[model samples]
Target: EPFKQQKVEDFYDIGEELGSGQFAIVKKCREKSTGLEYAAKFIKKRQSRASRRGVSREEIEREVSILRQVLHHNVITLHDVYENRTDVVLILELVSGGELFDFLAQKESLSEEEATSFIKQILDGVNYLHTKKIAHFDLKPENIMLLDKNIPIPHIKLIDFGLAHEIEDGVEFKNIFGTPEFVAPEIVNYEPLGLEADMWSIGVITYILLSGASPFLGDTKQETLANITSVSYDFDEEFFSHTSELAKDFIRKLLVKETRKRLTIQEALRHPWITPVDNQQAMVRRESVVNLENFRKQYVRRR
Candidate 1:
């Protein structure tokens, strides 16, 4: 059986809006029985005159199916489902920690210790999903949010499975979808896709987190796509003089142009970067503010 649809207003008192999309709007709410805070993500259905032609029906079913298959703390907790004459509503854990990018910016930059912790949590979540044969087609800073907005080290939760795809019978996706800068080459070339595509984005996310620079954003959208298609990127010496080779190696394994060469999520978890020699004194080789200033400015100048 699929998920059950309940009466939204009966169980929860809807409050203010949080975020929105084309056919859906997420709002804060409180459960009437439990008094627990939650976010209500509403998908407008045909019954609502205002939304007679909103979100695709198949997309809604697919997203719900994928969520129903997996359960993990690293993922956003889906609480309940509701549908009235107007919308299909999903109750989810109230995540206030905010976007990963904003949290990192609030810190100026991440200490290696903090970066590794953040990255590992993301990897763990991805690993869990992959074991279930699900690929998070969109993995980016905006989607990976912190559970707590404060504190340098993070408790990350992966959100927004709008583009997620699951495999059964060893299926692969042909329809291309993902953020351009972080897209894998196979996705751009319209080749068969699997979890490796997600690893590509993971590599891109890591690059940005470690250096505060996007690896494949070109002057024009087409140029950016071209850069991604060609797997073109570089590590400026200044950005890495204080960075660890182990960290760089981890990224290199993931960002390989060939999907077969990309690191499996399990392989990534076992990597030296994720598994530091000693957790007690673990911290990334610190990049100094004074040292990397020139490096950060160079990228700031163009593209």
Candidate 2:
């Protein structure tokens, strides 16, 4: 009942490798029946309990379970599933557009309206998840990708549900798992986490998109962790000189130390920075394009 017993090759003609992660490899696949393109994620299954070689079966099951529960345009769609002796293949919608920031950084020019529009799509996706009590534990530029960059406004697709969790009422879920630079303060403090954590990540993402500066990143992991735990960040003039007050205010509310004070998905979707009045366009300085390009270069090099 969990997966189809048939071989994946029976349905999909798997092609060249698209990308890979620690224990998974994504490949370009074409469905035989419809001749449609899709990305088949092959997750390696651990054969032994003693080895730390491959992903645990339970983890794969959990990820598949979470993926099956969500249905949204901005969230990656899981089309089919196939299991073999050593791996599980998940047929997912092919997002060929590439990374969100990478596309924006390469743009000829950038503006706050253009940036906020993309942010709105992300919020809409997360909003749908939060309404169902689901939390996407990992929300970062890597997880946020585009469907196609050729369009004026490319469609956003939130991928990688391996860390997603369905939060239950009265049950406390606490765990530290996410990118160091984007995690909320409570995550650093080892406090109980909830949907608010995603909001904090959104705040960090928006800040970077607007100014190309990582608010809490430090040289070392320890220093970055320390910065997050201490809630140490600021909007320096060098980065924020072209940013608007409305944009800064939106970030301020979400980056608060107290989770309760943080902006919820609904509030974030309604923020003026996200939903601006007609005829009031805030043009982000063209310098942001250069900053973003530099940031992307450094980010890629560091990785």
Candidate 3:
């Protein structure tokens, strides 16, 4: 009755497929015993060796290990992991609402306020992962999920650790990782990149959220890599013409080519756009403001 071993009928019922990728199919499942709905990411062990990006079994195991250890409100919860000789099954929290990509595409573009709210939650999630010594090398809209109808905007659950790596103290990663368009300049150059790479990704996501497009796109992957390596992109007035000056300034700070210059998570959280909604109200009382600041300092410290 568990995820991997469950027969079609063993589960409460199988809903429609949630997503499909090269090696796996994600389906909506329910635990009959407790009537709890969950997402089952089923990975087929067999993969063509000829494929360009074949995921190895060891990588899958590593991902499972990391997910099991890194648990937080903003990070995706691994309810259970099931494995057989030939397959691996990951039972994850069902964020039935859908992906951020779909939401953004539908809206064409998010308003500054809405975009900030979502970005703040994402920073909180990323900060938490960093605290655990885990860096989410692959951070893109497709990897983020929304729950509860995206109301109060579901806490951003950072997922897909296929490219994630554990960083030892003072250790640096030289191998290139992450989506081309979202990758930081240092990562593209194969320089020793670390936690800062994730912050760069956040900057890219924020740009896309507000502008409905990536700030750096190339005709080919190589061109994209070149753009990333050289920091060959610009934020034009058209893009930020309607955006608040504070929001524009914040994005610029994080998008800097120099990894050392990128805005830290704490710094980004203090930006006007990322601040909590209640804190933005103009006529806030003294006591309430103090309490809100305290809450922000604590909750916002961990993403």
Candidate 4:
């Protein structure tokens, strides 16, 4: 379908700003006819090839293209797209729940069982993407969101498809994509990248979720890159003291340097750690919640 030529205001009334990024700003909006709420993401369009001020037209199209294809419950929904002279307005499902870690950090108690449920939602979402050969180049804590926090086990919604790419058969897709901490070894080394890269990020996220410590973070970006490329990470006793072996095994399978040896989405979804435990009451890991609060404080300070 073509981008809606009509003005976004013609159909929806835009409201206060929700969030923003380097080239885009999301604002709260409501459809006039239905009174349905949505987040209108205004992506600034690049005016010329020579200028590096805004997002390229093709990049905006790619994000829209990829988003249009994925319609799972866990993945963010793109309701409509409108293009104006200066920018493209993407009408998206408003995910009111905050970032993943922030929501968890505010909790009074946390458990491995609860954590695995969150990880499972992410895995299920990624599983859907890999099945279509689409690689989400960026999969971080910030990008993973909750729909509404009031409910027990809020629905996960994977947001931000700006860096996503549909992997074509017989094509060698290689690029320096994704956040430094969550990116895989292949990404840091600039080796051929694929769905395995997402798996590695899941591993990093799972590690942080269970322990509240980043596995490969260093004093500088250079050191972090080196550590990632060298596959330098482990289950430190300070953080992993209460974590289960099944969880450790899951992380170990995903953090492999060799892409060929990494666990695929199919295998990951079936991993024992992802399966719900029988005794949820006795398995609560209070230390993880404490550590996450401390981690959140440090992260807030840095920001």
lDDT (CA) for every model shown?
Answer: 0.79, 0.85, 0.71, 0.85
Candidate 1 lDDT over residue span 163-230, tens digit each: 89886665666877767877888988999888898998999888877777778988888999889888
Candidate 2 per-residue lDDT over residues 32-112, each given as its tens digit: 999999999999989789877788888888888888888999899889899998889999989888899888867776767
Q: Estimate each model's TM-score.
A: 0.86, 0.92, 0.80, 0.93
* TM-score of structure candidate 3: 0.80
The deviation in Å at residue 58 for candidate 2 is 2.5
Q: How many residue pairs clash in each candidate?
A: 0, 0, 2, 0
Model 3 lDDT tens row, 97-186: 767655544443345566666777788898888878788898988888877554645556677777788888877669876678888888
lDDT of 4 at 94: 94
lDDT of 4 by residue, 1-303 (tens): 999999899999989998888889999999999999999999998988876678998889999999999989999999999999989999999988888887887788776767878888999999999999999989998899998988988989999898999998889988886678888988888788888889999998888777778889999999999999888988887777777777789899999999999999999987766763455522443223335665566456546
| Whole-model lDDT, model 1 | 0.79
Position 215, candidate 2: lDDT: 86
Name every residue pair that clashes in candidate 1.
none
